[PDB]
Ligand binder design. Structure first.
Ligand SMILES: *Cc1cc2c(cc1C)nc1c(=O)[nH]c(=O)nc-1n2C[C@H](O)[C@H](O)[C@H](O)COP(=O)(O)OP(=O)(O)OC[C@H]1O[C@@H](n2cnc3c(N)ncnc32)[C@H](O)[C@@H]1O
Length: 514
């Protein structure tokens, strides 16, 4: 009987004003709050008028979020509700156009002891979903402990990265952040608060991990901790080609116990990058190579509560500088604290902000591709599409460190069994600075995607963005397993049947049919 027409701001405001009256949660409907909640890292505009929510909700308790989700799901025309972490998304993933954005930071009333509780005996930290990874790090280090898996950039929320995967140079060893969670407190789209883990409501736990915010809002994540090292020996090695870079990265990320190899188990972190556009020396070698150079980045942790000593580090660096195929005379080694290494990108952000180059559009593209096609991709993209800004990252990870039961999508089919253990990530992290940059960079991104589809390179987007369910099903979830899309829909029907959660992800726009 009720109309399917989208609930108006009038109906939404009446429901949420009721919530502001019956809970300690606060509501803002003013243009300043809604303009901020309409944008993300993808744009630098004051407001994205199309993405503007009807209101911003400032929860005091996870129960306020539960009341909001229940109120929307049970109403005549359910309204969109989206959690916002730091809005580091670039394609509107945290927007709730004509709906309600949940300011997750409000739960911390962002660093707060109550939201970052360390259990020394249990070797875990109970972190609020809104908490930043930098604050999780400092809270753990105060007890000589550390999370095992990171993102390169630490000013991201626990709930935000866990809804994607959370990748960095440690993922080859300990898996992404989603592989390093003991339990979660989740507020489902239906408005229930469920504590879940591999032992209880595993279906919700696995759905939420890499789940693009489709099943519920993470209000707490219990993160396991390892003994913390004190320092890190940090290497940056130049390479003249993709072949030796990738071959060496694979040697470094090899599983020491199972596969082995001379360079296995030496590095605690392995990344790489492409430079398309001591400065005069690098520029001279660039012309000789053909305009494109590569970097291998590594780190060996030592000291503190680690088993690796400063003497062990010298021995490992000696092995790596002898065995690696980097360009001789282009090896850069630095010694930093463990915290300085993990928080390294902060110096980059500070520098960019100071030059007015941070608050600019970010037409980013992140991909996962099989090891078998990395050289074909390098030839067509790094030596083609992207041939002359921002960094271009390239590095391998180990599939075995990822749990296939979660929502996360890798470039493998579940039914193909144990194929290639190694896959690559490519991060095209450019900033639109000059006039015409945005249109040019967005077209180059679309061109990378069209080039892969045409060359038959299986390509999976990390932080995916598709407009149709046909693309989500056949291009994204489908090549990952015959039951992946059916599993995603089954979980959606169970946890968010009205499809109100994170509609900015563009998977669902309307309640699921019978
Ligand atoms: C901006 C940026 C992003 C980034 C990065 C560096 C920068 C400068 N480096 C990364 C890295 O090294 N490794 C990696 O895995 N990701 C990296 N990113 C991307 C980043 O992970 C994503 O942008 C991610 O979304 C985390 O950002 P944030 O915490 O800001 O989250 P969001 O953009 O607001 O929301 C993302 C989606 O998740 C939903 N959401 C938000 N909070 C929750 C909670 N608590 N529970 C459930 N869902 C939640 C949003 O609705 C949205 O769909």
């Amino acid at each position: 009987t009720p109309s399917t027409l989208a609930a108006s701001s009038a109906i939404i405001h009446d429901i949420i004003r009721g919530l502001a009256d019956t809970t300690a949660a606060r509501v803002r409907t003013d243009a300043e709050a809604t303009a901020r909640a309409s944008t993300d890292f993808g744009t630098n505009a004051t407001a994205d008028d199309a993405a503007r929510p009807a209101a911003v909700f400032y929860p005091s308790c996870a129960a306020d979020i539960a009341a909001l989700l229940r109120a929307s799901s049970a109403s005549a025309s359910p309204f969109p509700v989206s959690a916002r972490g730091r809005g580091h998304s670039t394609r509107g993933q945290a927007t709730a156009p004509g709906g309600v954005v949940v300011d997750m930071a409000s739960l911390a009333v962002t660093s707060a002891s109550a939201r970052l509780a360390v259990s020394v005996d249990g070797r875990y930290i109970d972190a609020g979903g809104e908490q930043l990874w930098v604050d999780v790090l400092h809270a753990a280090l105060a007890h000589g402990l550390t999370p095992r898996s990171w993102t390169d950039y630490l000013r991201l929320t626990v709930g935000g990265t866990l809804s994607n995967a959370g990748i960095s140079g440690q993922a080859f060893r300990h898996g992404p952040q989603i592989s390093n969670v003991l339990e979660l407190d989740v507020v489902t789209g239906t408005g229930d608060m469920v504590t879940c883990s591999k032992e209880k409501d595993a279906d919700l736990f696995d759905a939420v991990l890499g789940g693009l915010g489709q099943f519920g809002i993470i209000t707490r994540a219990r993160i396991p901790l390892a003994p913390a090292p004190a320092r890190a020996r940090w290497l940056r090695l130049l390479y003249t080609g993709a072949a030796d870079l990738t071959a060496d990265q694979e040697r470094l990320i090899a599983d020491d116990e199972r596969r082995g190899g001379a360079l296995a188990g030496l590095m605690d972190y392995v990344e790489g990058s492409v430079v398309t556009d001591d400065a005069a020396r690098i520029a001279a070698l660039a012309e000789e190579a053909g305009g494109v150079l590569y970097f291998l980045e590594g780190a060996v942790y030592y000291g503190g509560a680690s088993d690796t000593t400063a003497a062990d580090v010298d021995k490992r660096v000696d092995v790596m500088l002898r065995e690696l195929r980097y360009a001789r005379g282009f090896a850069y080694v630095q010694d930093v604290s463990y915290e300085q290494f993990l928080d390294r990108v902060s110096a980059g952000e500070r520098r960019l902000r100071g030059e007015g180059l941070w608050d600019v559009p970010h037409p980013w593209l992140n991909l996962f591709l099989p090891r078998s096609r990395i050289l074909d991709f390098a030839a067509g993209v790094f030596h083609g599409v992207l041939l002359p800004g921002g960094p271009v990252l390239v590095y391998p990870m180990n599939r075995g460190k990822w749990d296939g039961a979660t929502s996360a999508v890798l470039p493998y089919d579940d039914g193909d069994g144990d194929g290639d253990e190694v896959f690559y990530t490519v991060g095209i992290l450019r900033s639109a600075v000059a006039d015409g940059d945005l249109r040019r960079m967005e077209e180059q991104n679309a061109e990378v995607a069209r080039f892969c589809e045409a060359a038959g390179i299986p390509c999976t987007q990390y932080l995916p963005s598709y407009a149709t369910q046909a693309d989500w099903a056949a291009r994204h979830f489908g090549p990952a397993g015959s039951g992946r899309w059916d599993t995603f829909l089954r979980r959606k029907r169970k946890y968010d049947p009205m499809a109100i959660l994170s509609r900015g992800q563009r998977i669902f726009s309307s309640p699921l049919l019978a």
